[PDB]
Amino acid sequence: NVAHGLAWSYYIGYLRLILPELQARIRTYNQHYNNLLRGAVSQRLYILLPLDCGVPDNLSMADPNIRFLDKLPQQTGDRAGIKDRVYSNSIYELLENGQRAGTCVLEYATPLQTLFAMSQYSQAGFSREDRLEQAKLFCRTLEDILADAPESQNNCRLIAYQEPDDSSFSLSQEVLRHLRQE
Amino acid sequence: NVAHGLAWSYYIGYLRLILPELQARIRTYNQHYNNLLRGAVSQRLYILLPLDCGVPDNLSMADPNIRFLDKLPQQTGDRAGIKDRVYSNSIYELLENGQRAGTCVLEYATPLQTLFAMSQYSQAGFSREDRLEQAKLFCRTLEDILADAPESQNNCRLIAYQEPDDSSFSLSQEVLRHLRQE
Ligand SMILES: COc1cc2sc(C(=O)CCC(=O)O)cc2cc1SCSc1cc2cc(C(=O)CCC(=O)O)sc2cc1OC
């Protein structure tokens, strides 16, 4: 029930507003003289969606192969008393064994971090057994809403991963893999 | 259950981050030469929380006595892949019968607009009977979390109103009333 809400409020309150735009984000950045012909930024927002853990804020400390590159242009909007709502995203370079596969506008779905916090907040009453179905149904609902919303289904790709045990998991390869897919 | 999540994710994902700061927002704006001694902006974020209707985006069209004044300084942060998350708020002037009672940093709680949208989204399965308990428990949970979070309890005031029938309701007086309260 909780994850359901957050997925709807993430789409309606954020994606539903910035997915129809943001094409010029990677248009101006890739054609900037200080990076002209140095990787063309991809046409979509790659959302990192962990499934077992709380979302980290810094990508460098999470995966060494992940490296902060730069920040793309900012935006504006009339949002609940904010006639100029600034939207900003940060570009990252996927460096797999020194070899940089590429760079794209990247960010984690923030509502996923909030539904993890809820489990260690005894007032919210969210339990760790439900947690699994929560983070999962947040990605599921975000995939399901993106299906019924074709104007949002494109312009964004979802990167979900489950790494509970050790299998040299790398959240950096998942991205490079998803970019080459289509 | 849904409203519960949104209130937690609004605090943890937005208020819990910008309430400890934002004091300098009204400090620099009130002392700007183009407004020096023309109303000192209040020290808190006044959140508009309707209880029966969907939040409007524009305040002018909602209440004539409400009038857009200006926008305050912007902010930055390390948020899920965004090393510079821009936070921006807009100041409004409460004009009651020509007489401007004052001006303060104002905005509607955006998660309230999303929980209304959910009622007319048959996929989300949210019903209009629950809607009442939803919008209500979103404000209730936001008041309850602000009680257990003293570092956030201050620096913000909640303005909840229920106007289903006609009683010349004015969402402009509610604000001026709340500012003089303390
Ligand atoms: C209304 O519902 C949401 C709006 C946004 S906007 C947003 C970002 O831009 C990503 C930056 C970040 O989150 O770090 C994420 C969400 C997620 C939700 S789901 C409800 S819980 C919540 C509410 C809230 C309000 C925020 C505002 O800045 C106010 C303006 C607005 O919402 O349009 S951020 C935010 C984050 C939330 O949970 C993650």
Author numbering:
A (entry chain A), B (entry chain A): 154 to 317, 319 to 336
Would you copy out the relevant sentences from the publication that reported this structure?
As an adaptor protein, STING scaffolds the phosphorylation of downstream effectors, including TANK-binding kinase 1 (TBK-1) and interferon regulatory factor 3 (IRF3), which induce the secretion of type-I interferons and other proinflammatory cytokines to elicit immune responses against the infected or damaged cells. Under physiological conditions, it forms a weakly associated (KD = 18 mM) non-covalent dimer by stacking the aromatic ring.
Because thioether linkages represent a previously unexplored chemical space of MSA2, we synthesized a series of sulfur-containing dimers D1–7 with systematically varied lengths to gain further insight into their structure–activity relationship (SAR). Three-atom linkages appeared to be optimal, with D2, D5 and D7 being the most active compounds in the THP-1 assay. Either shortening (D1) or lengthening the linker (D3) by one atom led to impaired cellular activities. Further lengthening of the linker (D4 and D6) completely abolished their activities. Interestingly, their binding constants to purified STING ligand-binding domain (LBD) did not seem to correlate completely with their cellular EC50, a phenomenon reported previously. One-microsecond molecular dynamics (MD) simulations indicated that thio-containing linkers with four or fewer atoms benefit from more favourable interactions (for example, CH-π with Y167) and greater numbers of hydrogen bonds. Well-preserved interactions with residues such as R232, R238 and T263 were observed (right).
